Design a binder for this molecule. Structure first.
Ligand SMILES: O=c1c(O)c(-c2ccc(O)cc2O)oc2cc(O)cc(O)c12
Ligand SMILES: O=c1c(O)c(-c2ccc(O)cc2O)oc2cc(O)cc(O)c12
Ligand SMILES: [Cl-]
Ligand SMILES: [Cl-]
Ligand SMILES: [Cl-]
Ligand SMILES: [Cl-]
Lengths: 216, 216
């Protein structure tokens, strides 16, 4: 194939790219990298971060999942994943950047214990509540009646967050506390494109248990 | 005016917006906020971060300088500040995001001392060298023959970085160590649009001396 994806069977950032390519109907070869022994192609294609995902189109590389997503949207414009109105597009980019900035709040879930881990989980619930109230509102998806780049960017809050919660022994995304966001997470996971393209939960839980063990 | 900018006379992030609006020939009212007593409009328009800049167009707010810049480019498409080719646009977004991620390296310049501050400055030089070699290359500007959103996003490495260097007593962007980036910084500051729209250096230096005093 003319499109290659240097990926992973577990990274949520790689899954954002898989979803976008499948939504566009773009054929691609998935090259699963071993992060303990990175290939010559990965280091050549992404010299700045040496990380996956890396999309390679016509032999030219695009690194960083958020940059890859906008490249896919611009390259294959059919089945749009962003709105046409500039203000609506700015709101979508604003929420995507908000999610990208709050990564440190989720890290604390694998670094804190007891009366400190409860506080870290409460801080994550408040991050999600802002997203729920000001971002999702009463829509079925962040993209309205169907998923868009904003839903894709927040997909890591579904099975990956469920695995983090089970590995850390704390609750974050619950129906009592975040009713609309919890209903969104269920609806997103049930979209056939997402359902057919997510890691096996038991394998993902084992991976998150290892990451928590390393982060202590 | 139909375009308002809730700004500042010193923030480099606010100056990115001033430059973009002036490059588009967009008339606007500049509302300088007092950060020790934020207005009702600022808190209403930017509830998530409560920060400047905030662009208000037709009474609708757009916060975060990078989101504002793409909104300006999409709303006033004449005098383009991004290329048309999707791969070229992805490279521009990639470098803009790289600059946005390396903010912590610059923070160390106002938190470290002696044999630790020399190390922090060396780390900043390596961040800039990657940008110079892989981003700028042999072009006059990141946008080629004229400035684009990438040059605008890196404008904080000109007089603001010069002020940080003088306040901290360390050298970072020098011609001997970064020849092309130093020539770029001189060329950027000499562009008439930039020259006529930058803070007074003595006032900016006094501001950075205060920020370093607070950051210790
Ligand atoms: O930072 C995250 C992360 O690295 C990862 C992550 C998980 C598995 C993997 O193989 C790689 C990752 O970067 O997942 C997240 C999931 C979340 O719900 C929230 C997060 O902030 C992360
Ligand atoms: O983080 C910065 C910053 O907050 C600021 C900054 C300076 C003045 C001001 O009023 C507000 C700011 O955020 O300037 C920077 C300049 C640089 O060259 C590099 C930086 O990382 C910053
Ligand atoms: Cl990524
Ligand atoms: Cl992470
Ligand atoms: Cl900003
Ligand atoms: Cl900052």
């Amino acid at each position: 194939a003319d499109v290659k994806l240097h990926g992973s069977w577990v990274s949520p950032f790689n899954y954002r790219v898989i979803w976008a390519l499948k939504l566009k109907g773009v054929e691609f070869e998935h090259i699963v990298e071993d992060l303990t022994n990175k290939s010559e192609l990965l280091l050549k294609y992404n010299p700045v971060y040496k990380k996956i995902p890396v999309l390679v189109h016509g032999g030219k590389p695009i690194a960083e999942s958020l940059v890859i997503l906008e490249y896919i949207e611009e390259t294959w414009p059919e089945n749009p994943l962003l709105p046409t109105d500039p203000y609506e597009r700015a709101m979508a980019r604003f929420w995507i950047q908000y999610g990208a900035t709050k990564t440190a709040a989720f890290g604390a879930l694998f670094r804190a214990s007891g009366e400190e881990l409860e506080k870290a989980a409460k801080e994550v619930v408040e991050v999600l509540r802002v997203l729920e109230e000001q971002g999702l509102g009463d829509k079925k998806f962040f993209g309205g009646d169907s998923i868009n780049l904003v839903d894709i960017s927040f997909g890591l809050f579904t099975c990956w967050l469920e695995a983090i919660e089970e590995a850390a022994g704390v609750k974050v995304l619950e129906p009592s506390t975040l009713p609309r966001l919890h209903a969104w997470a269920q609806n997103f996971i049930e979209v056939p494109l997402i359902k057919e393209n997510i890691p096996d939960y038991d394998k993902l839980l084992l991976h998150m248990k290892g990451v928590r063990e390393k982060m202590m």
